[PDB]
Symmetry: C2
Subunit: 213 residues, 2 copies
């Protein structure tokens, strides 16, 4: 399971997960209007489109989003791209809402704190590389901290709604660099958004994901 | 020459072209705030980033943006991607500003109108296929009406800031589907932007481009 730590993202039918907190709970980084649009409009659309594609292939409604993305070649040609894009959008955003919190921010704790220190040198260096990868992702995409197939932490960015699980990597945490995630408040200033995002990061949840990976 | 009909896009240095009209002139489709950000911030950035990359290889300052994008293999590897993205961004937006007008809109007129009817059947059908292609372009990109190598009109979409001249096609006209082009006024409603955009299309300029094509 990738979306949730305890269960896989179902497709019979695919469901839009409600926000665990209020729309205005992340104001020190993200405006309430964007939270509403991003969740109620963007995330909802990915779920709806995925369900529409699955209707024409009921034999696939038994499998989870994870299973479909892990083996896109087995998905029928007529809906493969639709499943890739919308399935990815569903999974990516489902992870996104969970790794942020009203009482987020601060420096990491526990397991991931020491793992980050060993791999990247320090939390501040990790932060710099993460933001750098974020800024370098030209066009639409995401920046992730993953546990690669070899079991090592690695910063990687992906295009559009592609997810690292397609390569066998476990996405521990990630930030959305599609313009819709920051344009209302930041406009063209992506680096400012990337900087402020750290103030709402939910380290408790990120630690649970690190253990599961 | 692709950016302008009578001249190539220079790189000694690259220059941000002035807007042919006022910032609030296209208000029946695009808000003034977006015209400012899009032209003054986004397009300006592609120009600046391009200039920075070319300073590292002064030789390239003797050629044009079109010449560079037509043969990326000859562009030194250390700045190839940078030139592709920013050179493309500069070329694409330069064309964009010119094909819109305060006095635009209406159905196609003249040569282009005849060729559209002959190729697509009617303007209504062309418009549907154009908007469709624009909606189908997942992530960031552009929708184009090009004259392909065989000399025929064709609707194609490209990712990010890629330009059709990279594939031997002449970009007659095109619409920007990056979210920054419509988020402030339409938010997630991309198809609404695609539909209203037709009210500001400069058919006169498009005819000159079809002819040069
Ligand atoms: Mn998003
Ligand atoms: Mn643009």
């Amino acid at each position: 399971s990738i979306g949730f730590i305890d269960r896989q993202l179902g497709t019979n039918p695919a469901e839009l997960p409600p926000l665990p907190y209020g729309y205005d709970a992340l104001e020190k980084a993200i405006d309430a209007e964007t939270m509403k649009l991003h969740h109620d409009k963007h995330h909802a659309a990915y779920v709806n489109n995925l369900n529409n594609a699955l209707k024409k292939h009921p034999e696939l409604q038994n499998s989870s989003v994870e299973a479909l993305l892990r083996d896109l070649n087995s998905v029928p040609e007529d809906i493969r791209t639709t499943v890739r894009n919308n399935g990815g959008g569903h999974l990516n955003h489902t992870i996104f809402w969970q790794i942020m919190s009203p009482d987020g921010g601060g420096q990491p704790t526990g397991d991931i704190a020491q793992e980050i220190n060993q791999t990247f040198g320090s939390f501040e260096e990790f932060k710099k590389q993460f933001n750098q990868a974020g800024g370098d992702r030209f066009g639409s995409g995401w920046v992730w901290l993953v546990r690669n197939p070899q079991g090592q932490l690695q910063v990687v960015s992906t295009p559009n709604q592609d997810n690292p699980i397609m390569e066998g990597s476990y996405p521990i945490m990630g930030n959305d660099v599609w313009e819709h995630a920051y344009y209302l408040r930041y406009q063209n200033r992506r680096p400012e958004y990337l900087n402020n995002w750290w103030n709402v990061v939910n380290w408790s949840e990120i630690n649970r994901r690190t253990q599961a990976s």
